[PDB]
Amino acid sequence: LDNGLARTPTMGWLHWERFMCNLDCQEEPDSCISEKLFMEMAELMVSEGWKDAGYEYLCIDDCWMAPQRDSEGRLQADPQRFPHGIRQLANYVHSKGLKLGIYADVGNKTCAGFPGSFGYYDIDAQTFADWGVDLLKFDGCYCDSLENLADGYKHMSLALNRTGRSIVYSCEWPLYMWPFQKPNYTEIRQYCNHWRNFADIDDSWKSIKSILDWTSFNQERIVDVAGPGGWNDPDMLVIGNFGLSWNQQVTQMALWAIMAAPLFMSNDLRHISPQAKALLQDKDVIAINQDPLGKQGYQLRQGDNFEVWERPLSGLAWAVAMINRQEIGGPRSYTIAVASLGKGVACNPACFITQLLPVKRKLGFYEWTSRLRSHINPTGTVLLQLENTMQ
Amino acid sequence: LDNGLARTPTMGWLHWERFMCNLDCQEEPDSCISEKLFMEMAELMVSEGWKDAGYEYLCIDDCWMAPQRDSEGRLQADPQRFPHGIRQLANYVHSKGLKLGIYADVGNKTCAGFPGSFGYYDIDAQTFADWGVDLLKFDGCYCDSLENLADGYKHMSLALNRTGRSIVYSCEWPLYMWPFQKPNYTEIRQYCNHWRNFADIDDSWKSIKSILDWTSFNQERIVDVAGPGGWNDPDMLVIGNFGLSWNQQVTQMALWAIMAAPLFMSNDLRHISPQAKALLQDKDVIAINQDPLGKQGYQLRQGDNFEVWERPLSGLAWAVAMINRQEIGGPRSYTIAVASLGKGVACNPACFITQLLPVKRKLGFYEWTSRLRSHINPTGTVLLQLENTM
Numbered sequence: 001l002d003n004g005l006a007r008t009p010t011m012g013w014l015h016w017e018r019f020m021c022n023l024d025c026q027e028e029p030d031s032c033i034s035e036k037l038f039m040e041m042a043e044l045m046v047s048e049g050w051k052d053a054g055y056e057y058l059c060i061d062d063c064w065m066a067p068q069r070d071s072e073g074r075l076q077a078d079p080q081r082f083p084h085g086i087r088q089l090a091n092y093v094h095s096k097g098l099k100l101g102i103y104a105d106v107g108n109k110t111c112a113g114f115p116g117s118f119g120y121y122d123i124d125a126q127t128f129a130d131w132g133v134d135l136l137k138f139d140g141c142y143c144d145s146l147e148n149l150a151d152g153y154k155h156m157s158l159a160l161n162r163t164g165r166s167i168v169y170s171c172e173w174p175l176y177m178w179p180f181q182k183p184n185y186t187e188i189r190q191y192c193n194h195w196r197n198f199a200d201i202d203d204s205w206k207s208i209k210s211i212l213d214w215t216s217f218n219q220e221r222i223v224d225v226a227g228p229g230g231w232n233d234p235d236m237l238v239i240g241n242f243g244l245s246w247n248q249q250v251t252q253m254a255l256w257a258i259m260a261a262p263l264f265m266s267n268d269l270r271h272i273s274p275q276a277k278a279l280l281q282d283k284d285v286i287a288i289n290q291d292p293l294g295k296q297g298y299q300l301r302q303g304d305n306f307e308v309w310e311r312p313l314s315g316l317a318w319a320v321a322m323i324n325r326q327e328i329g330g331p332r333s334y335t336i337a338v339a340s341l342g343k344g345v346a347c348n349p350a351c352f353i354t355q356l357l358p359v360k361r362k363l364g365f366y367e368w369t370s371r372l373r374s375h376i377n378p379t380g381t382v383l384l385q386l387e388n389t390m391q
Numbered sequence: 392l393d394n395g396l397a398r399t400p401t402m403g404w405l406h407w408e409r410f411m412c413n414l415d416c417q418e419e420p421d422s423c424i425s426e427k428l429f430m431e432m433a434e435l436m437v438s439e440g441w442k443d444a445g446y447e448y449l450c451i452d453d454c455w456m457a458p459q460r461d462s463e464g465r466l467q468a469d470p471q472r473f474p475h476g477i478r479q480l481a482n483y484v485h486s487k488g489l490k491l492g493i494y495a496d497v498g499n500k501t502c503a504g505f506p507g508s509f510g511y512y513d514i515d516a517q518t519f520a521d522w523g524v525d526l527l528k529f530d531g532c533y534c535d536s537l538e539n540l541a542d543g544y545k546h547m548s549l550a551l552n553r554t555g556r557s558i559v560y561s562c563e564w565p566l567y568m569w570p571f572q573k574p575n576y577t578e579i580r581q582y583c584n585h586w587r588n589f590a591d592i593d594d595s596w597k598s599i600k601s602i603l604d605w606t607s608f609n610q611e612r613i614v615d616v617a618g619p620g621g622w623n624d625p626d627m628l629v630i631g632n633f634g635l636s637w638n639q640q641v642t643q644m645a646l647w648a649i650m651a652a653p654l655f656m657s658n659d660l661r662h663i664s665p666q667a668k669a670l671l672q673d674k675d676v677i678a679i680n681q682d683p684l685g686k687q688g689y690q691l692r693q694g695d696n697f698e699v700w701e702r703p704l705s706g707l708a709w710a711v712a713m714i715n716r717q718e719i720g721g722p723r724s725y726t727i728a729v730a731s732l733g734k735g736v737a738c739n740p741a742c743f744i745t746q747l748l749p750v751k752r753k754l755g756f757y758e759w760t761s762r763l764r765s766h767i768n769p770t771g772t773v774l775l776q777l778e779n780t781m
């Protein structure tokens with residue numbers, strides 16, 4: 001989407017995977033979708049260095065609506081859980097130096113069942129723009145035919161542009177189109193800052209595996225569409241929660257940066273391990289995700305329950321991610337000739353390889369002729385940066 | 392097995408899951424099955440407080456044999472990876488105040504392919520007893536028919552008793568027998584200090600779930616056989632390794648204590664988080680696994696992606712483990728009336744409930760009439776101890 005926005009992949013936070021559709025403020029106040037929730041997440045992002053890291057978009061997800069619309073025809077917040085309305089939440093958010101994201105649906109209902117945007121595309125867009133929204137997640141539940149999905153998705157893009165406001169439009173167009181026919185990513189790219197590709201994400205090394213595996217499966221179709229202003233969305237960062245071990249949390253971080261995925265944390269910020277914070281806030285690794293060049297990574301090689309990913313970065317740099325898919329035994333050794341790395345460019349005549357994950361460590365120089373040895377942890381990932389030189 | 396042994400479930404450590412059958416000492420010396428491996432694990436168990444915790448059995452698994460037997464007769468260690476022989480390893484291990492375990496097979500070959508024990512039952516047994524072995528894992532690969540499995544398993548048990556030596560006999564009888572016919576656990580109990588029931592274990596929350604899920608599935612059949620001298624083995628403690636998150640590692644610890652499973656750590660002791668060390672060495676939680684009464688726990692209730700387990704302990708005590716199987720969102724609330732707990736005994740007229748896991752915390756008194764409230768972590772377990780008034 002030629003809108004000036006998402007020049008690198010959007011970073012921020014999103015309630016869904018951690019807070020889902022909890023609307024019982026009575027017994028579970030500390031996790032119902034209330035303004036205070038975002039009031040508090042926002043408040044933190046600032047004080048805990050999430051902004052300096054580069055997370056900027058506090059994003060509301062599904063389950064913020066009232067039962068129905070006011071009498072014009074406009075979406076409202078919940079009067080109970082959002083007494084102050086979005087108008088003020090926006091104001092507050094902004095004062096913190098952040099941007100606010102919101103949710104709505106292409107259909108007749110959200111995936112939860114609160115009013116859809118259909119028929120109301122023109123009016124929702126403006127309604128949002130009046131509030132001070134800086135992002136939209138546009139979901140695609142409750143849709144008759146592909147024709148409505150397509151026209152609906154497109155029609156919203158136009159209505160947002162018209163408002164006059166810089167609003168990151170994030171779409172789920174392909175995910176929903178998928179089961180019926182291949183999506184025209186070329187065309188999608190035209191209307192959406194970024195698009196959701198596969199199933200929802202869990203707190204499971206299983207779910208992760210299946211995303212990478214499905215992603216890598218049809219990379220031929222998606223890696224190339226990806227660049228400045230339009231990204232492949234493999235869904236939220238779940239690091240900080242419960243489901244993944246350390247090496248699985250690295251694997252997540254590494255491959256999201258490799259894949260040039262947007263980085264949307266979905267977690268209680270108020271209870272997070274030094275572990276994960278420091279991982280989530282890794283300067284070097286955010287860089288790689290955030291590389292100005294904007295070429296998506298891919299799966300170079302595979303087999304022997306090992307996986308090789310790599311991403312080209314600007315300045316003759318390249319990222320190498322090596323995964324170990326054997327769940328059993330110990331650290332396994334895996335080695336390749338740097339001759340096979342970066343299509344053969346980085347490391348001609350030589351490259352400087354420093355390791356970023358699981359721990360930050362310079363490794364020597366590396367002639368064209370040489371091989372890189374390595375011990376990767378079961379279900380973990382080793383993340384290298386290869387630099388050019390000349391020495 | 393009426394042998395004076397495993398009066399509470401055996402604790403120690405086992406190479407397999409973490410080190411497997413790595414025999415390449417050239418390129419991976421830090422993890423090949425070498426005496427120095429056991430020399431090192433032993434040395435640590437001592438210094439790191441693993442012994443004081445109650446881990447006592449340093450256990451060699453598969454892949455310690457030579458190509459073939461001496462002439463006699465007898466099984467040998469690898470000349471290269473075990474130059475000093477088991478004789479000496481035993482001696483050393485003992486001097487640390489620990490007990491050595493070894494491995495062999497019912498069949499013609501181990502699961503790897505090194506000589507089986509068949510035909511050699513009488514001689515293997517003695518061989519081991521000469522070496523000073525204190526445990527045997529008897530595996531059941533490479534077996535024609537169930538008859539040989541049965542007779543082979545049994546025959547060994549007698550040969551061991553006869554040696555004259557206290558040797559904890561750990562069998563894999565049921566697991567192999569399964570896929571053909573239900574096992575007679577009554578019978579097995581008679582010959583084995585503990586028995587492996589299900590598939591191997593991985594470094595996966597998957598694998599865990601499936602073990603509990605399979606165990607609770609047929610608890611009818613197995614929970615009652617269990618008690619002093621004969622345990623159900625749900626396979627190794629894998630905490631400390633790579634594959635499980637914290638709340639998954641607690642879930643494992645809690646439910647191993649609930650189940651009255653033996654505690655066999657399989658990990659590199661030389662590189663382990665404070666996290667895991669403290670969890671593996673939890674006094675209170677070992678106690679519950681170690682309760683002298685020795686009744687196995689079971690699944691009280693299930694549904695709503697929540698699971699309630701409970702074990703009765705001596706002295707009107709009971710353990711309650713509540714697991715949360717929803718892998719999404721956050722801490723879920725789950726509650727029941729203490730009236731339902733421990734068949735209705737603990738908490739009549741009242742109980743003291745202190746939480747052990749995830750963090751050790753007293754909770755007040757709990758009248759008969761009261762319900763216990765609780766926020767359990769996704770894939771975690773909350774593990775309580777109920778003391779009845781009284």
Ligand SMILES: *[C@@H]1O[C@H](CO)[C@@H](O[C@@H]2O[C@H](CO)[C@@H](O[C@@H]3O[C@H](CO)[C@@H](O)[C@H](O[C@H]4O[C@H](CO)[C@@H](O)[C@H](O)[C@@H]4O)[C@@H]3O)[C@H](O)[C@H]2NC(C)=O)[C@H](O)[C@H]1NC(C)=O
Nearest residue numbers: 001002003004005007158160161162163164165166167228
């Ligand atoms: C909605 O309507 C249109 C529909 O596409 C959209 O117009 C486009 O807006 C962008 C806004 O930047 C324009 O892109 C610019 O093109 C000119 C060159 O002619 C440059 O000034 C801009 O350069 C910036 O970005 C560069 C690209 O990487 C950077 O290198 C550089 O540093 C600059 O900062 C940018 O390329 C584009 O020309 C128009 N297209 C049209 C229709 O003419 C509009 O912005 C949208 N409006 C809203 C409110 O959503």
Ligand SMILES: *[C@@H]1O[C@H](CO)[C@@H](O[C@@H]2O[C@H](CO)[C@@H](O)[C@H](O)[C@H]2NC(C)=O)[C@H](O)[C@H]1NC(C)=O
Nearest residue numbers: 497498499500509532533534535536539540543
């Ligand atoms: C180990 O393998 C040998 C086969 O070489 C078994 O001995 C034979 O087993 C078959 C039964 O399937 C008998 O019919 C033969 O008479 C035996 N052959 C000989 C030459 O003695 C042996 O019992 C096997 N044992 C186990 C437990 O698998």
Ligand SMILES: *[C@@H]1O[C@H](CO)[C@@H](O[C@@H]2O[C@H](CO)[C@@H](O)[C@H](O)[C@H]2NC(C)=O)[C@H](O)[C@H]1NC(C)=O
Nearest residue numbers: 392393394395396551552553554555556557558
């Ligand atoms: C071999 O078998 C006998 C009988 O099962 C074991 O005897 C029991 O051993 C414990 C410890 O000696 C006693 O507490 C029980 O009272 C014994 N019961 C019987 C039947 O006498 C014996 O210990 C075993 N011996 C060895 C060394 O393996």
Ligand SMILES: *[C@@H]1O[C@H](CO)[C@@H](O[C@@H]2O[C@H](CO)[C@@H](O)[C@H](O)[C@H]2NC(C)=O)[C@H](O)[C@H]1NC(C)=O
Nearest residue numbers: 545573574575576577578579580581582612616
């Ligand atoms: C499983 O085997 C057990 C143990 O042998 C069987 O119980 C024995 O049965 C014999 C008669 O066949 C009795 O005389 C013994 O007293 C029993 N042993 C003991 C001490 O219990 C048992 O019947 C078998 N189980 C089933 C249900 O098939």
Ligand SMILES: OC[C@H]1NC[C@H](O)[C@@H](O)[C@@H]1O
Nearest residue numbers: 016061062111112139200
């Ligand atoms: O609630 C439905 C759900 N579909 C998929 C998205 O991840 C989520 O935010 C959206 O709200």
Ligand SMILES: OC[C@H]1NC[C@H](O)[C@@H](O)[C@@H]1O
Nearest residue numbers: 407452453502503530591
């Ligand atoms: O190969 C030996 C190996 N076979 C499978 C068993 O279950 C495992 O624990 C044993 O050590």
